[model samples]
Target: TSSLVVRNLKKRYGSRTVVKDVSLDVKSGEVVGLLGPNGAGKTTSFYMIVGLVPLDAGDISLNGSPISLMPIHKRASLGLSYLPQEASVFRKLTVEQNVRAVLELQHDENGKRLSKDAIGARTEALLEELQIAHLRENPALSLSGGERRRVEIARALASNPSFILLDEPFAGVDPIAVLEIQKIVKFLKQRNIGVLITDHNVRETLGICDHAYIISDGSVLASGAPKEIIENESVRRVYLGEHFRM
Candidate 1:
């Protein structure tokens, strides 16, 4: 399995270190969570890893090659996919077309561009696997929040990347959609894709994460399984309260 590793990640803003000693590792097919309270530097650390923000010090490597200095597109080309919290679909494009747009960019093992039939086959497979086949022809703009997330996921998977960084995935969705998203995340795990996610929904995140890091005051205060984090005294005092469960 591939690995996404970060070591002693540190980022600063105007002499203020927002991300300090932030280090975590994720393996392909595993689900990891970056959890913290507001202004605790979770977002900054996540952005650094996603290549959206530069780090002051530290190295980020994917599958053993350093990529801390790479551009966002460069990272994407190297098997790292990012899903922003906001909507990321073409308003006028249909779901199938939107996914096909991503598929068109993929090349085969021979480095040759995929043929039309090949793209079509893959598109069909993605639609089915993501359970969006019925919404294939629906315009992206018309899809609900949950459905749009599915489309976005299919597009991200088009790159067939080893790792996916998701920002606020549980935000702006209803309870039912929340469950749908959780299922989809598990599906990604089943497909052996490492997922690193940051969300304010502690229950939802801890529910699906196989492992997690709890950041506090600009650094990781604790890291472990959900139950371990819940039971940790430091984590309770800083993030989840003593009453937290599951």
Candidate 2:
């Protein structure tokens, strides 16, 4: 629903620069992915995008609108939601209940109540969309890794966020589950929700993302269209490693 722009961004932990001159755009309804080896500052960039960590030298905006002046909670109302790498679901709650709780908290411009039926309808739709309707009655902890991940993603979409940042969304899961997750990502995009994902699965990330970025040594090395980036000399040599070279 909105474009997220970062310019000349920089971040450091005392003497070490964790993020340097990082700038990228997550256009409304676009799927952009961030890739690099471990400790490549992927998470740092993700944090900066969502305003979790303050930038040392740059600015962030949404649809040419600056959110630096607003608080984190306020951003949610502006149609921004995030699904972190870790499971943040209320594990004790049933899958449907967890989704319902978030849907209830969702609000509109007028601050009026969003209807229960409307919420249920959305939940049912998401369950259907993610192909997880059967797991809705079970508690989160009782679900398998793949199921839990699906539920978390569904929960994030429950609020109909225009922009979403998913951190390491596919860390450990079966190949089939991973494929299903990609389908979910595509579905989200069709609804005009922009996505920025940080993951180690470079090949899969590249396949689904329209654009990709490489972050290492606390900075962005290169970013561009997926095919161009995957074939680029520098990315192939340094980021992808010799084994992945064409």
Candidate 3:
């Protein structure tokens, strides 16, 4: 099993420290959530690990390699994938193209290029797995928020990631679609893919996560399974409401 370890992550925008002493881990098949209120440095901490914003002081290791300084694309080469909350689909292209475009990058251990048929089968499989196979011929522009999210996830899976970090899979999503995202996260775990999710949706995130980190004032105030976090007094005072429920 693969592991992504983020330890002591720190980042600042000149003068003020935004993310300080943040850390989390995601082993293959585990879904971990990082959640906190707005401007609480949760996003900064998550982004630092995502390789978008550089870490000022910290170390990140994936499968034992120091990935703290690697470029985003290089991180993907090492089985790390990221799904942004923003638009990730090719609006003009068909869903098949959106996914097939990524499968084209697949290579064997011998640096071999995958044949047309091989890529075709892989694309077909992922679309089916993601439940977007029926939309294969539909232009991505026609897909709803949830459908597009699924297509983007399928594309990310096209890279054959062992770990996928999600940034707000619930934001801008319909209520029922939020449930769909949860189902997909579970599906990802079933495939033995580790998931690291950072979202503002507390209930939805903690609802499916095996473990979670609640950050406040740029530091982790609590870290545990959903039950412990929900019942923790400290977490309730700062992040989850005093009367927060599942």
lDDT for each residue of candidate 2 in 135-207, tens digit (9 for 90 to 100):
8889887887778877888888887788888877778766887897788789888988999998888877888
Clashing pairs in 3: none
- Ranking of candidates on lDDT, top first: 1, 3, 2
lDDT of 3 by residue, 48-145 (tens): 88899998999999998999999999999889998887567778999999999988888978889999999989988998888888999999878887
Candidate 1 structure, TM-score to reference: 0.96
Clashing pairs in 2: 18-218, 19-218
Compared with the true structure, the alpha-carbon lDDT of candidate 3 equals 0.89
Name the regions of candidate 2 deviating beyond 4 angstroms.
69-71
> Against the unseen true structure, what C-alpha lDDT does each candidate score?
0.91, 0.80, 0.89
Best by TM-score: 1
Query: What's the number of clashes in each of the models?
Result: 0, 2, 0
Query: Superposing all C-alpha atoms, what RMSD in Å does each candidate have to the true structure?
Result: 1.1, 2.2, 1.3
Residues 126-244, candidate 1: write the lDDT tens digits. 99988899999898878878788889999999999999998998886779888888998999999999999999999999999999999888899999999898999999887777677
